[PDB]
Design a protein around this ligand. Structure first.
Ligand code: HEM
Ligand SMILES: [N]
Length: 179
């Protein structure tokens, strides 16, 4: 199951996270449910205590993609939120409304002007799907900062064990993440 002991980084300025867009450069899926490798980019925003974020996934094996919009409330305790998610097309038109039994919780472990580290617990039945850690950069295929690489170690992980995305033949939809 996903860890219940993940807490966001204390003192982090949320503006460093809710800004620009993010590309996943490295991911650690602690308990994968499928064997395909994904690329992902997303654009998180917040307003008045509610996060809305536009999400994109690209299956590098199968060459398929899908789009979502997550929505949830910013924890008063720190940079963390539990979101419900709709399925959308590449123009953000809704294909399916959220299934309220499913959620994900995102916890920000580090963020600076170039890079971030987050933990995501996706619950896509009624079941934690297991921990996913993603290293993020504002620019595609860029190098994460030293600070973010330190945060990986401090989360008890080893960067050597992450899957990098730079060599996967990723295709992104930058128009979508710029909406
Ligand atoms: C490279 C990074 C990521 C990988 C490896 C990954 C992996 C996966 C996989 C394997 C699935 C299931 C696909 C299927 O239906 O078979 C999935 C779905 C999903 N992921 Fe990710 N993911 C990544 C990043 C993210 C990010 C950054 C978020 C949220 C901020 C996120 C949220 C979701 C959600 C909401 C779904 C469910 C989509 C739906 O059923 O409509 N994922 N992801
Ligand atoms: N995910």
């Amino acid at each position: 199951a996903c860890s219940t002991n993940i807490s966001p980084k204390q003192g982090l300025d949320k503006a460093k996270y809710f800004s620009g867009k993010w590309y996943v450069t490295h991911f650690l899926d602690k308990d994968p449910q499928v064997t395909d490798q994904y690329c992902s980019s997303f654009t998180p925003r917040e307003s008045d205590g509610t996060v809305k974020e536009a999400l994109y996934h690209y299956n590098a094996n199968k060459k398929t993609s899908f789009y979502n919009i997550g929505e949830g409330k910013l924890e008063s305790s720190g940079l963390q939120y539990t979101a419900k998610y709709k399925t959308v097309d590449k123009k953000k038109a809704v294909l399916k409304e959220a299934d309220e039994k499913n959620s994900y919780t995102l916890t920000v472990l580090e963020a600076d002007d170039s890079s971030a580290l987050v933990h995501i617990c996706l619950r896509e039945g009624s079941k934690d799907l297991g921990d996913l850690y993603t290293v993020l950069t504002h620019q595609k295929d860029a190098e994460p900062s030293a600070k973010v690489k330190s945060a990986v170690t401090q989360a008890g992980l080893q960067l050597s064990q992450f899957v990098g995305t730079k060599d996967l033949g990723c295709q992104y939809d930058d128009q979508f993440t710029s909406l």
